[PDB]
Structure 1
Amino acid sequence: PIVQNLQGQMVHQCISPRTLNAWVKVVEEKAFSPEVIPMFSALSCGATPQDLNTMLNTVGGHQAAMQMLKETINEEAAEWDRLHPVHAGPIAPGQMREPRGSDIAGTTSTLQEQIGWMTHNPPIPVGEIYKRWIILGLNKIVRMYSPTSILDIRQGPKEPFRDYVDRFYKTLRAEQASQEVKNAATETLLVQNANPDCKTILKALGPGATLEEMMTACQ
């Protein structure tokens, strides 16, 4: 990554063994469960595009996903290139060239170029722009590998309300609803899919009810 040192300046640091192993192990344990995304974002704090490729490339399984991710990355890089074309031919000697999509993606740029962009004044945050593309791709994968529709999350006749709400919001998170819809489906789909006993209790609460109130009610 690029870090600030102890005596004030932005420099390249080797990606740590601890980071490398954390990422590989989180993928092995959690696959594309939605919580792996914030974990990825945090393990790649300060990452250069090289570091991002490193983390992605160290994953051994899930090669269908990694291939979908390449595709998403390619589409963002092409849109980057549409937006910010680079003048071709020879660069002014010893000057910074402008990044193309593939440069931001780390496939046509050196570490040194990526460092120069990232620490320039003003900076071109290539590590952050690439990370956004990756996360975009990753979220598509989370969604795709979500094993259950929220329409099938329904409270069992003797399933504790809490356990049902846990299933419901876990599913919703993977299906990747807006926080409008997570804020919203509470007074609607959550009640509808409650079991008959709990449902009567919830209806009787009246609308406006917080989730806490609903969860107390069906305790």
Structure 2
Amino acid sequence: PIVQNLQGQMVHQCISPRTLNAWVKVVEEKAFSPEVIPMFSALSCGATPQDLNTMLNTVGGHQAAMQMLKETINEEAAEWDRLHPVHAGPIAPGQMREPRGSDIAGTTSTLQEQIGWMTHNPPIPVGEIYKRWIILGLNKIVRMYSPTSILDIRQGPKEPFRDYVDRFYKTLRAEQASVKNAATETLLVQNANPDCKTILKALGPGATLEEMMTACQ
């Protein structure tokens, strides 16, 4: 990554073994549960494109997902190039060249180039632009791999309301409803069991989740 040292300058630091292992193990344990995305983002704090590729490339399973992610990346890289075309032919000697989509994705740019963009004044934050693309991809995968429709999360007749709500919002998070506060006074009540539904209906509209959860305790 690029870090500030103990004296203020932005400099390159090797990716730690700790970071490398943390990311690999989160994917091993959680696959594409939605909580993997914020973890990915945090573990990739300060990352260069190189570092991003390293993290992705260290994943051994899930190669259908990694291939889908390459595809998303390629789509975002092609839109980058449409928005910001680069002058072809030879670069002014010693000068910074402008990044293309593939340079941002770290496939046709060197670490040194990446460091130059990222630390230039003003900076071209290639690592953050690429991260956004990867996260866009990752979110598609989380949605695709969501195993259950929100329509099938219904409270069991003996199921504690809290366990139902946990299932419902974990499902909603994966399906990626933006709806989130919203769905509360509608689908969540509809999919509640008969006894709880009666209670919740009686509360009247505008009930907070806390209120709903106390009511159905």
Length-normalised TM-score, structure 1? 0.99
Deviation at 1:52, TM superposition (A): 0.0
Question: Which residue is 1:24 aligned to?
Answer: 24
**Secondary structure in structure 2 of the residue aligned to 1:11:** strand
1:50-91 Cα deviation digits (max 9, x unpaired): 000000000000000000000000000000000000000100
Separation (CA, whole Å) in 1 of partners of 2:185 and 2:56: 40
Q: d(CA) in 2 for partners of 1:96 and 1:171? A: 46
Name the CA distance, whole Å, in 1 between partners of 2:126 and 2:88: 20
Shift of 1:48: 0.1
The 2-side partners of 1:33 and 1:143 are apart by: 9
Aligned to 2:104: 104
Question: Within 2, Cα distance between the matches of 1:195 and 1:71?
Answer: 42
Counterpart Cα distance in 2 of 1:140 and 1:168: 20
* RMSD of Structure 2 on Structure 1 (CA): 0.2
- Alignment partners' CA distance in 1, 2:199 and 2:112: 63
Secondary structure in 2 matching 1:3: strand
Counterparts of 2:131 and 2:177, CA distance in 1:
21
Structure 1 CA distance, aligned partners of 2:106 and 2:186? 45
Moved over 3 A (4+): none
The alpha carbon displacement at 1:33 in A equals 0.1
Please list, as runs of the form range in 1=range in 2, the aligned pairs for 1:67-146 lying within 5 A after superposition.
67-146=67-146
Please report how far the alpha carbon of residue 8 of structure 1 lies from its aligned counterpart in structure 2 after TM superposition: 1.1
In the TM superposition, what whole-angstrom CA distance separates every residue of 1:163-205 from its partner, at most 9, and x where no partner exists? 0000000000000000xx1010000000000000000000000
Q: What whole-Å deviation, never above 9, does each CA across 1:98-128 have from its counterpart, x for those lacking one?
A: 0000000000000000000000000000000
Partner Cα separation in structure 2 for residue 118 and residue 208 of structure 1 = 48
Aligned partners of 1:110, 1:8: CA distance in 2, in Å? Answer: 24
Q: Distance in 2 between matches of 1:13 and 1:133?
A: 23
Q: Give the match for residue 164 of structure 2.
A: 164
CA distance in 2, matches of 1:206, 1:8: 57
Q: Counterpart of 1:47 in 2: which secondary structure?
A: coil
Deviation at 1:13, TM superposition (A): 0.2
**Structure 1 unaligned regions, length at least 5:** none
Give the percent of matched residue pairs that are identical in Structure 1 and Structure 2: 100
Unaligned runs of 5+ in 2: none
Please give the alpha-carbon distance, in whole angstroms, between the structure 1 residues aligned to 2:8 and 2:33: 38
> By how many angstroms is 1:24 displaced?
0.1
Please state how far the C-alpha of 1:43 moved relative to its aligned partner: 0.0
Q: Secondary structure at the match of 1:20?
A: helix
C-alpha distance in 1 between matches for 2:118 and 2:8: 16
Q: CA deviation at 1:31?
A: 0.2
